[PDB]
């Protein structure tokens, strides 16, 4: 028999799903958490050998381990020791799609663990063996005799091992499959790997025992009194003697108990459940729990006797809130909840997909520390102790089943196939078995990218039938099926529709206006920050907090998948799809997340933090509305701090207190502002300030800022007479300009600035041309490769343009004296296979106080697509270690991505200005720059500039990061106009006409000068 | 203001400030050359403060001597259009009478400009360029001081507005502030060519 290929057979001998059980013996300790000596790790040293397929393991392994097999650690996945290659894919199938079987060639690992159990486990009660994860399907002996078959991979398998197990030595012997017929319904876009990779426990528990318990919150209109009701389930013989015990506690204080003999109420004719016991607890006032404030109590179930002797204990946190949908919107405790949620994949920067209590503790410091007060178990349940994690700091959790059938053609071929109903079952229903007692999750997901079938529909109100208390959500078939509650459209777009045949992605404003729709909307994906990304999320959270029905959405994703390789000489970097032999592979897809795979922040994360505050501020006149977002907590742990700069010098500042009520406003009234007569733009920056120490976050940290600008002073003073007038000297091919120390040279042949000089250092390697592209970007090149070619993508309209390829003819280049300046004008035209695209016109004035003044006139022709660029393009001769700019920053921005940088004097050195993005492209562009300084050269006027080690042909010609070498000097690209860089997908062009250059004629003038 | 002689053209740079009881709102910089063809290239640099309120206009103004019958035009007509009303007028070459210039509205106000004109000619005259004219027989002074277009009088010559930007007009109501922040002139610098020349 072959169960890996038939999906009737899901699992054998394996125990039921329940909340995770410690088997505690003792009250207080299950009160505290304190670990039990009941539950043992398995997590260590295993045994481990490799095969090309199931058949080729030989029988005496059932005996004894293979000598010639290596030592790992479990948990882990083997692919991330040699024995394969991890699989990357989107949407194609890693296999042959050909259901319900799998390839003969089927790699296959042998895990072994030789241990000892004590004797004590033994005489009485049950053992059992708990794998919390195995990818995919397995097989377990025990002492050479067969156990079960787990299939499933994201939920824990428990097999009985009592009548297995024997004093002394005993040896496990697993048999773990990469591909089932279960892998049909994971084709998640991730890395595809396979192996033990989450913890292997062994449970021991008494005769009689707590097989389940269901904890639920039933409150009034007010919240102020609380019904708890837990309903416990027992396995063994039924005795007259045995109670339970409900222990409510808020740290050590005991509020709430409860003691009843085992029976329930009469439910159908025959009578009711003789191993069910229901206790309803009344609490007066309680704490209720939130994002905001997570109020968390202790549930502890003690099944003893009527002697008060204690048999088993079982403890549980449970938090008082209340999730429910009224009037097409999602209420939790009563309010209206803002969802500032994120999608997050379990991705270990070293050990691939191996999560461990650090990784996620820092991930959700990073996630609340950033504004994000939601998170999505994508695509899967997650590891049980992120759940804990999560109700301690205070994020929702939407927990997904492990259900995904992308490579299908059509999507819902196995969803509408009945024959599959049951399998998809198990990956449902035992996930809420599971999870329903986490106060963190809140809402429940059937999966994702599924198609719409009757299964789907089954399942959905089969988890609306058993657990009321949380709403429960579907994207597949359109977002607008009877499989949802909430309305969760991926990659939706604010204004404009697009209507794809029978599954059309509507707007969000006009998807909520539709005839006879209700719901409330949740984007779970939205704004791909795929590489430089993250364009038009100021319009997403505009649309968001405009529009009531609009509750928030998921940004996809939060951490790359990007997986470590070593070079020649050991050097780590990472790799993507494609690098490790993987064919067919979806290239960069895997890197979506707003963080690095070292958790370093991308750029994006500010304007992620930026978008998603909890304070709207509204300057009028000289006081500033600060409205609440919070809808629990008062502003007892934030504070506005104010400051006023005239050109990035400071001025004045102060620090009020804030005092707003939660989704309150607040008036703060500033003292008198300076009234400078200087020259210059007066901007006012406030900024919360936490001074003390949250659990999620340290003294100082910033949770919001804002700014503004003041009354404008226009300079109209007049520069003054230089006494020395520039020298001209024409040649019979150079114009060259004398102002002493320094020297211009002007080609007559290419019509260019060929070179400066100051004393006898030459500054220019290249001369100073015209730019009108870009490194493409992944939002730019979208899915288009070399093989298949998307001519809706931005980089194809360019190259086939021949933006890239356009060579520059020099149509004018006259030069002529002034009376105190020198006056050097040139005209080009880009022109590819006769068609000319730009038209180039500069005024070179050099006058004789030193600056060099460049007006550019650029004509773009209206049928060639709008270029990504109208600027200058140099490569300076010097290596500085500082840079300095006056305008917005400190972060990489973007025309359509800079709400969340702030305008003032910016210092940095020069490694920081470039961004290390994996797949090299346009990056480290500042905008609204007011005034740049490197070396000894300065910049004035208004431009955006990028300045870096790296040219943009190498940045074009590169695909990886470690690849890249610096080149000799320093490549800036100061640009007049810049082009939007998208961000609502990473497939389609997701630039808004307002960011794209179609203007047609651009103007921009810049000030060269020696500081 | 200073002119100095080029090679084979003379090159005219003047820079204005507009103030009002000592704020600076508008700074202007232009530069006229005239070459030995006969065109006259003005390029005009407007930096508008930013706490000032969004002027309706930027451009230039004259009253030209000399009354035509006919006005041409190469650009979006043949009727009254403005930045946020245009989607109607089609690009075109349009002649029409100069009284036909003028939309007789019966409260005096701003009317007759016309978007996206790249040649005007009237009489001897051509300018072109990328602008918004408007030609009348009435100065924006008497059009501001006069509330019935029948005590308008027909000044001496030609008044001719062109502009290198207008602000739109509004009309989503007439007692709250309708023009939308994509139509008002709030980016702070604005840049704009214009070629004068004898046909």
């Excluded at 359109?478 to 909430?486: E, L, N, S, V």
């Amino acid at each position: 028999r072959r169960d890996w290929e038939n999906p009737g057979v899901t699992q054998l001998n394996r125990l039921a799903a329940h909340p995770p059980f410690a088997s505690w013996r003792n009250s207080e300790e299950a009160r505290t958490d304190r670990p039990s000596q009941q539950l043992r790790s398995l997590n260590g040293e295993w045994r481990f050998a490799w095969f090309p397929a199931p058949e080729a393991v030989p029988e005496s392994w059932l005996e004894c381990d293979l000598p010639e097999a290596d030592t790992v650690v479990v948990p882990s996945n083997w692919q991330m020791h040699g024995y394969d290659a991890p699989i990357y894919t989107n949407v194609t199938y890693p296999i042959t799609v050909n259901p319900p079987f799998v390839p003969t060639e089927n790699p296959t690992g042998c895990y072994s663990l030789t241990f000892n159990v004590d004797e004590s486990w033994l005489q009485e009660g049950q053992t059992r063996i708990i794998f919390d994860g195995v990818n995919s399907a397995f097989h377990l002996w025990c002492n050479g005799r067969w156990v079960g078959y787990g299939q499933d991979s994201r939920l824990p398998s428990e097999f009985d091992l009592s009548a297995f197990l024997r004093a002394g030595e005993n040896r496990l012997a697993v048999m773990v499959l990469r591909w089932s017929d279960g892998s049909y319904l994971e084709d998640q876009d991730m890395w595809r790997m396979s192996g033990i990779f989450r913890d292997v426990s062994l449970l021991h528990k008494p005769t009689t025992q707590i097989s389940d318990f269901h904890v639920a919150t039933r409150f009034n209109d007010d919240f102020s009194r609380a019904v708890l009701e837990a309903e416990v389930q027992m396995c063994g013989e039924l005795r007259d003697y045995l109670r339970v015990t409900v222990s409510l506690w808020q740290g050590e204080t005991q509020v709430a108990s409860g003691t009843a003999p085992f029976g329930g109420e009469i439910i159908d004719e025959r009578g009711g459940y003789a191993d069910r016991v229901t206790l309803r607890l009344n609490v007066e006032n309680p704490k209720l729990w939130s994002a905001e404030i997570p109020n968390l109590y202790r549930a502890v179930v003690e099944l003893h006797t009527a002697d008060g002797t204690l048999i088993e204990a079982e403890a549980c946190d449970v938090g008082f809130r209340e999730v429910r949908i009224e009037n097409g919107l999602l209420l939790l405790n009563g309010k209206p909840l803002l969802i500032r949620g994120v999608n997050r994949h379990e991705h270990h920067p070293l050990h691939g997909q191996v999560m461990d209590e650090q990784t996620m503790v820092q991930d959700i410091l990073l996630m609340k520390q950033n504004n994000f007060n939601a998170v999505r178990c994508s695509h899967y349940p997650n590891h049980p102790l992120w759940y804990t994690l999560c109700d301690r700091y205070g994020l929702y959790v939407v927990d997904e089943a492990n259900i995904e059938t992308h490579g299908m053609v059509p999507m819902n071929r196995l969803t509408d196939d009945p024959r599959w109903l049951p399998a998809m079952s198990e990956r449902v229903t035992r996930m809420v078995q599971r999870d329903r007692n986490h106060p963190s999750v809140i809402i429940w997901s059937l999966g994702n990218e599924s198609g719409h079938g009757a299964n789907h529909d089954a399942l959905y109100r089969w988890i609306k039938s058993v657990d009321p208390s949380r709403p429960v959500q579907y994207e597949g078939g359109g977002a607008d099926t009877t499989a949802t509650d909430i309305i969760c459209p991926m990659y939706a777009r604010v204004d404009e529709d697009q209507p794809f045949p029978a599954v059309p992605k509507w707007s969000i404003k006009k998807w909520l206006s539709l005839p006879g729709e209700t719901r409330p909307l949740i984007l779970c994906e939205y704004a791909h920050a795929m590489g430089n990304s993250l364009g038009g999320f100021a319009k997403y959270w505009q649309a968001f907090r405009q529009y009531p029905r609009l509750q928030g959405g998921f940004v996809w994703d939060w951490v790359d998948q990007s997986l470590i390789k070593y070079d020649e000489n050991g050097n780590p970097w990472s790799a993507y799809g494609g690098d490790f032999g993987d064919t067919p592979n979806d290239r960069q897809f895997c890197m979506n997340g707003l963080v690095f795979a070292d958790r370093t922040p991308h750029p994006a994360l500010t304007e992620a933090k930026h978008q998603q505050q909890f304070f709207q501020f509204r300057l009028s006149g000289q006081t500033i509305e600060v409205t609440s977002e919070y809808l629990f907590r008062h502003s007892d742990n934030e504070l506005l701090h104010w400051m006023v700069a005239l050109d990035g010098k400071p001025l004045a500042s102060g620090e009020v207190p804030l005092d707003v009520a939660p989704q309150g406003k607040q008036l703060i009234e500033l003292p008198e502002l300076p009234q400078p007569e200087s020259a210059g733009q007066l901007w006012l920056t406030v900024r919360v300030v936490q001074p003390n120490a949250t659990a999620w976050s340290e003294a100082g940290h910033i949770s919001a800022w804002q700014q503004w600008r003041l009354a404008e002073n226009l300079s109209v003073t007049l520069p003054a007479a230089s006494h020395a007038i520039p020298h001209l000297t024409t040649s019979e091919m150079d114009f060259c300009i004398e102002l002493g120390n320094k020297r211009w040279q002007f080609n007559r042949q290419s019509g260019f600035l060929s070179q400066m000089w100051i004393g006898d250092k030459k500054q220019l390697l290249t001369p100073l041309r015209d730019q009108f592209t870009r490194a493409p970007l992944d939002n730019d090149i979208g899915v288009s490769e070399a093989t298949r070619i998307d001519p809706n993508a931005w980089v194809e309209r360019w190259k086939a343009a021949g933006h890239y390829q356009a060579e520059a003819a020099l149509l004018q280049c006259t030069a002529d004296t002034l009376a105190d300046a020198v006056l050097i004008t040139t005209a080009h035209a880009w022109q590819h296979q006769g068609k000319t695209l730009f038209i180039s016109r500069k005024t070179y004035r050099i006058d004789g106080s030193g600056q060099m003044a460049i007006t550019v006139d650029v004509e773009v022709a209206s049928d060639t697509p709008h270029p990504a660029r109208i600027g200058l393009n140099c490569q300076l001769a010097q290596v500085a270690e500082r840079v300095n700019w006056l305008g917005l920053g400190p972060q990489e921005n973007y025309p359509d991505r800079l709400t969340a940088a702030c305008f003032d004097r910016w210092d940095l050195p020069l490694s920081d200005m470039y961004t290390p993005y994996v797949f090299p492209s346009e990056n480290g562009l500042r905008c609204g720059t007011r005034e740049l300084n490197y070396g000894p050269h300065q910049w004035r006027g208004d431009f955006q500039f990028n300045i870096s080690r790296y040219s943009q042909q190498q940045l074009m010609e590169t695909s990886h990061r470690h690849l890249l070498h610096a080149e000799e000097g320093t490549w800036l690209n100061i640009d007049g106009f810049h082009m939007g860089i998208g961000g609502d997908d990473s497939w389609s062009p997701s630039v808004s006409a307002e960011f794209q250059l179609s203007a047609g004629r651009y103007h921009y003038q810049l000030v060269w000068c020696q500081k």
